[PDB]
Design a binder for this molecule. Structure first.
Ligand code: HEM
Length: 104
């Protein structure tokens, strides 16, 4: 994974609805700090759909790779309205960036 490439992908496709830094604001979507190793739908203070709260998996590289390829397929009923990122390489780079930005 290439975090530098990932950072650019984040700005292009995710930043309009998400922040990732510690203490960052919730916007259309939840601030994502602390995401890795945590069960779905647990960002503090964000109002999730029951679907996002109930998916039940632990976010990590593997689960984010599947989710980001097609969000509504992975979480039917989600209010995250976004097509997904088809390219495996792009998802890997994006996730690399997310791991770095949301864990420090
Ligand atoms: C960009 C490609 C992108 C990423 C990365 C991303 C991630 C993401 C995660 C990991 C969650 C779940 C967090 C958790 O379970 O705690 C999540 C949730 C929502 N998102 Fe998102 N998201 C990306 C892009 C976008 C875009 C462009 C929007 C807005 C149009 C958006 C919105 C949302 C919303 C809303 C949620 C909450 C969904 C719910 O059902 O509660 N995301 N995202």
């Amino acid at each position: 994974g290439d975090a530098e490439a990932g950072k650019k992908i984040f700005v292009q496709k995710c930043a309009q609805c998400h922040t990732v830094e510690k203490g960052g604001k919730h916007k259309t979507g939840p601030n994502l700090w602390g995401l890795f190793g945590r069960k779905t739908g647990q960002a503090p203070g964000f109002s999730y759909t029951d679907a996002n709260k109930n998916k039940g998996v632990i976010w990590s590289e593997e689960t984010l790779m599947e989710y980001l390829e097609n969000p509504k397929k992975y979480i039917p009923g989600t209010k995250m309205i976004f097509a997904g990122i088809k390219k495996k390489s792009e998802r890997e780079d994006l996730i690399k960036y997310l791991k770095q930005a949301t864990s420090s």
